[PDB]
Tab-separated table of all heavy atoms in Angstrom:
chain	number	residue	atom	x	y	z
A	752	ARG	N	-6.405	10.200	-0.618
A	752	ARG	CA	-5.425	10.905	0.291
A	752	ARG	C	-5.684	10.550	1.702
A	752	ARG	O	-5.665	11.654	2.584
A	752	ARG	CB	-5.539	12.362	-0.073
A	752	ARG	CG	-5.301	12.769	-1.538
A	752	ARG	CD	-3.857	12.321	-1.989
A	752	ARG	NE	-2.948	13.450	-2.242
A	752	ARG	CZ	-1.640	13.355	-1.897
A	752	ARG	NH1	-0.940	12.332	-1.610
A	752	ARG	NH2	-0.936	14.599	-2.384
A	753	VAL	N	-5.709	9.421	2.020
A	753	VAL	CA	-5.971	8.872	3.529
A	753	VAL	C	-4.839	8.060	3.869
A	753	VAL	O	-4.427	7.193	3.224
A	753	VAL	CB	-7.208	7.948	3.405
A	753	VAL	CG1	-7.395	7.348	4.895
A	753	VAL	CG2	-8.483	8.670	3.010
A	754	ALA	N	-4.230	8.483	5.092
A	754	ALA	CA	-3.138	7.744	5.585
A	754	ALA	C	-3.645	6.375	6.230
A	754	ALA	O	-4.569	6.318	6.776
A	754	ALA	CB	-2.458	8.710	6.659
A	755	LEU	N	-2.692	5.367	6.125
A	755	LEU	CA	-3.006	4.155	6.615
A	755	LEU	C	-2.053	3.685	7.806
A	755	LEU	O	-0.914	4.164	7.862
A	755	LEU	CB	-3.057	3.100	5.543
A	755	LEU	CG	-3.914	3.213	4.281
A	755	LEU	CD1	-3.669	2.074	3.263
A	755	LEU	CD2	-5.288	3.419	4.798
A	756	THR	N	-2.520	2.687	8.517
A	756	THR	CA	-1.760	2.032	9.575
A	756	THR	C	-1.003	0.803	9.060
A	756	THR	O	-1.567	0.115	8.339
A	756	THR	CB	-2.601	1.690	10.930
A	756	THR	OG1	-2.980	2.975	11.460
A	756	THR	CG2	-1.772	0.975	11.789
A	757	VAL	N	0.339	0.671	9.335
A	757	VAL	CA	1.059	-0.594	9.060
A	757	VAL	C	1.219	-1.325	10.234
A	757	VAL	O	1.855	-1.016	11.257
A	757	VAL	CB	2.485	-0.202	8.516
A	757	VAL	CG1	3.215	-1.559	8.235
A	757	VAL	CG2	2.486	0.768	7.351
A	758	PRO	N	0.404	-2.520	10.380
A	758	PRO	CA	0.519	-3.315	11.631
A	758	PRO	C	1.515	-4.360	11.697
A	758	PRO	O	1.914	-4.976	12.771
A	758	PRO	CB	-0.892	-3.973	11.512
A	758	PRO	CG	-1.249	-4.174	10.073
A	758	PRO	CD	-0.547	-3.035	9.397
A	759	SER	N	1.994	-4.769	10.523
A	759	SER	CA	3.029	-5.794	10.348
A	759	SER	C	3.849	-5.684	9.082
A	759	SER	O	3.464	-5.016	8.121
A	759	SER	CB	2.385	-7.169	10.355
A	759	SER	OG	1.623	-7.371	9.113
A	760	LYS	N	4.898	-6.527	8.976
A	760	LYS	CA	5.765	-6.385	7.691
A	760	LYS	C	4.906	-7.143	6.625
A	760	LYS	O	5.057	-6.817	5.435
A	760	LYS	CB	7.142	-7.037	7.947
A	760	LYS	CG	7.998	-6.653	6.803
A	760	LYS	CD	9.079	-7.735	6.250
A	760	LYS	CE	9.966	-8.211	7.298
A	760	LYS	NZ	11.180	-8.675	6.676
A	761	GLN	N	4.253	-8.130	6.931
A	761	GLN	CA	3.510	-9.023	5.992
A	761	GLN	C	2.368	-8.192	5.308
A	761	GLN	O	2.252	-8.140	4.048
A	761	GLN	CB	2.993	-10.237	6.571
A	761	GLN	CG	2.471	-11.275	5.572
A	761	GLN	CD	3.402	-11.419	4.380
A	761	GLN	OE1	4.700	-11.658	4.512
A	761	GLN	NE2	2.837	-11.290	3.125
A	762	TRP	N	1.626	-7.318	5.977
A	762	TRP	CA	0.750	-6.450	5.530
A	762	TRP	C	1.266	-5.595	4.379
A	762	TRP	O	0.753	-5.375	3.347
A	762	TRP	CB	0.000	-5.625	6.630
A	762	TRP	CG	-1.183	-4.752	6.013
A	762	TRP	CD1	-2.429	-5.102	5.948
A	762	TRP	CD2	-0.905	-3.429	5.459
A	762	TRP	NE1	-3.076	-3.970	5.296
A	762	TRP	CE2	-2.123	-2.928	5.154
A	762	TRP	CE3	0.156	-2.515	5.444
A	762	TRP	CZ2	-2.368	-1.694	4.551
A	762	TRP	CZ3	-0.016	-1.203	4.855
A	762	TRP	CH2	-1.271	-0.838	4.464
A	763	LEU	N	2.545	-4.933	4.837
A	763	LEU	CA	3.032	-3.950	3.894
A	763	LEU	C	3.350	-4.584	2.635
A	763	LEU	O	3.110	-3.922	1.583
A	763	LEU	CB	4.168	-3.287	4.483
A	763	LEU	CG	4.938	-2.268	3.643
A	763	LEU	CD1	4.013	-1.123	3.233
A	763	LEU	CD2	6.122	-1.630	4.430
A	764	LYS	N	3.942	-5.760	2.553
A	764	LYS	CA	4.250	-6.503	1.354
A	764	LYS	C	3.069	-6.847	0.456
A	764	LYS	O	3.026	-6.655	-0.726
A	764	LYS	CB	4.934	-7.832	1.615
A	764	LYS	CG	6.377	-7.580	2.162
A	764	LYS	CD	7.008	-8.979	2.236
A	764	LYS	CE	8.472	-8.966	2.405
A	764	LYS	NZ	9.024	-10.237	2.037
A	765	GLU	N	1.896	-7.252	1.146
A	765	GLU	CA	0.564	-7.517	0.405
A	765	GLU	C	0.131	-6.107	-0.118
A	765	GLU	O	-0.436	-6.257	-1.259
A	765	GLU	CB	-0.398	-8.043	1.416
A	765	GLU	CG	-0.269	-9.410	1.889
A	765	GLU	CD	0.054	-10.472	0.743
A	765	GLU	OE1	-0.819	-10.864	0.044
A	765	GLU	OE2	1.296	-10.782	0.521
A	766	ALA	N	0.093	-5.110	0.583
A	766	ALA	CA	-0.282	-3.786	0.079
A	766	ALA	C	0.479	-3.359	-1.106
A	766	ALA	O	-0.157	-2.817	-2.073
A	766	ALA	CB	-0.174	-2.771	1.254
A	767	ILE	N	1.779	-3.443	-1.031
A	767	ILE	CA	2.590	-3.191	-2.335
A	767	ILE	C	2.176	-3.878	-3.613
A	767	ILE	O	2.100	-3.401	-4.632
A	767	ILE	CB	4.122	-3.362	-1.969
A	767	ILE	CG1	4.593	-2.258	-0.982
A	767	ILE	CG2	4.993	-3.311	-3.269
A	767	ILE	CD1	5.882	-2.560	-0.151
A	768	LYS	N	1.840	-5.290	-3.397
A	768	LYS	CA	1.502	-6.146	-4.408
A	768	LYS	C	0.175	-5.715	-5.081
A	768	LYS	O	-0.101	-6.110	-6.231
A	768	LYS	CB	1.410	-7.621	-3.936
A	768	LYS	CG	2.619	-8.320	-3.703
A	768	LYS	CD	2.471	-9.571	-2.998
A	768	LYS	CE	3.944	-10.244	-2.745
A	768	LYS	NZ	4.034	-10.729	-1.446
A	769	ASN	N	-0.765	-5.047	-4.291
A	769	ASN	CA	-1.994	-4.488	-4.752
A	769	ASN	C	-2.042	-3.214	-5.337
A	769	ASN	O	-3.142	-2.714	-5.733
A	769	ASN	CB	-3.007	-4.869	-3.654
A	769	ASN	CG	-3.372	-6.288	-3.512
A	769	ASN	OD1	-4.291	-6.697	-4.140
A	769	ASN	ND2	-2.707	-6.852	-2.578
A	770	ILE	N	-0.864	-2.592	-5.437
A	770	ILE	CA	-0.874	-1.224	-6.075
A	770	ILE	C	-0.803	-1.322	-7.531
A	770	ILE	O	0.257	-1.875	-7.948
A	770	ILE	CB	0.446	-0.295	-5.449
A	770	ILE	CG1	0.093	-0.045	-4.010
A	770	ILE	CG2	0.534	0.889	-6.334
A	770	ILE	CD1	1.356	0.445	-3.305
A	771	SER	N	-1.869	-0.918	-8.195
A	771	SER	CA	-2.019	-1.233	-9.606
A	771	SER	C	-1.217	-0.306	-10.644
A	771	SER	O	-0.805	-0.696	-11.653
A	771	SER	CB	-3.443	-1.140	-10.017
A	771	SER	OG	-4.013	0.143	-9.891
A	772	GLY	N	-0.837	0.964	-10.112
A	772	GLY	CA	-0.238	1.886	-11.004
A	772	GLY	C	-1.275	2.977	-11.447
A	772	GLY	O	-0.787	4.043	-12.061
A	773	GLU	N	-2.486	2.737	-11.220
A	773	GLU	CA	-3.587	3.606	-11.721
A	773	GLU	C	-3.808	4.814	-10.959
A	773	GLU	O	-4.087	5.905	-11.293
A	773	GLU	CB	-4.984	2.937	-11.920
A	773	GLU	CG	-4.842	1.555	-12.482
A	773	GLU	CD	-5.057	1.436	-13.998
A	773	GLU	OE1	-6.096	2.131	-14.477
A	773	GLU	OE2	-4.363	0.723	-14.792
A	774	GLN	N	-3.467	4.790	-9.531
A	774	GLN	CA	-3.490	5.832	-8.613
A	774	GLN	C	-1.878	6.074	-8.254
A	774	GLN	O	-1.358	5.307	-7.585
A	774	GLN	CB	-4.246	5.482	-7.397
A	774	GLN	CG	-5.581	4.994	-7.615
A	774	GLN	CD	-6.379	6.249	-8.246
A	774	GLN	OE1	-6.165	7.432	-7.904
A	774	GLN	NE2	-7.371	5.758	-9.045
A	775	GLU	N	-1.371	7.211	-8.802
A	775	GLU	CA	0.025	7.481	-8.774
A	775	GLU	C	0.543	8.454	-7.621
A	775	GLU	O	1.667	8.791	-7.475
A	775	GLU	CB	0.534	8.039	-10.057
A	775	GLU	CG	0.370	7.079	-11.200
A	775	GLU	CD	0.650	7.662	-12.558
A	775	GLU	OE1	0.180	8.803	-12.785
A	775	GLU	OE2	1.221	6.895	-13.333
A	776	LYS	N	-0.437	8.980	-6.864
A	776	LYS	CA	-0.138	9.886	-5.705
A	776	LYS	C	0.557	9.131	-4.551
A	776	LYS	O	0.436	7.809	-4.474
A	776	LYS	CB	-1.431	10.566	-5.166
A	776	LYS	CG	-2.049	11.421	-6.241
A	776	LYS	CD	-3.040	12.529	-5.609
A	776	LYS	CE	-4.423	11.766	-5.226
A	776	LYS	NZ	-5.339	11.773	-6.522
A	777	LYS	N	1.178	9.861	-3.558
A	777	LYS	CA	1.859	9.193	-2.489
A	777	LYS	C	0.975	8.590	-1.485
A	777	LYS	O	-0.220	9.008	-1.329
A	777	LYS	CB	2.746	10.240	-1.762
A	777	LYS	CG	3.726	11.054	-2.600
A	777	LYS	CD	4.726	10.060	-3.176
A	777	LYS	CE	5.495	10.709	-4.332
A	777	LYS	NZ	6.659	11.522	-3.952
């Protein structure tokens, strides 16, 4: 439950790709 910084558009796309589905919270 820790908020993160988005530094670039590329980071956000990488981050989405690594979301496994095992942690379903916002």
